[PDB]
Every structure is written in structure tokens, then in C-alpha cells.
Amino acid sequence: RQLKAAYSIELAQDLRAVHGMDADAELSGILATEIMLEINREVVDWINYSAQ
């Protein structure tokens, strides 16, 4: 499983300013968390899939 993300440099500046959060870490904090949720869903999904 894999995922990608595309953030512009100027967005990193604006997000670092104004609000005050690093634009880079959020996408890493989103993609990695999202993938783990899907796998954690797939394990649950298979159980109901295979249940009698």
C-alpha cells in the first residue's frame, strides 16, 4: 500500500506563518495515519467477510 502528497513551497511559508504549523509534518501526519486506519479497517473487514 502507498500514498502520495503534493504541497507547494509557498503554502509551507503561509502555513508556517499566519497559523503557525509546519506544512510538511501535517501531510506526513496525515498519510501515515490514514494508511494505518485503512489496514486496521481491512483486518476488521476481512473478519466480517469470512464470518459464518
Partner 1 sequence: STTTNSNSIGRPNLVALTRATTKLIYSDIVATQRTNQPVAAFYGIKYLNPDN
If one counts every other C-beta atom within 10 angstroms of the C-beta of residue 31, the result is 14
Q: Of 9 and 18, which CB lies nearer to partner 1 in the complex structure?
A: 18
Position 8: which residue type?
A: S
The contact mask relative to partner 1 for 1-40 (x = CB under 8 A, - = no) is ------------xx--xx----------------------
Residues contacting residue 24 through CB under 8 Å, at least 6 positions apart? 7, 12
* Nearest CB to partner 1, comparing residues 16 and 41: 16
Q: Interface with partner 1 by CB under 8 A: which residues? A: 13-14, 17-18
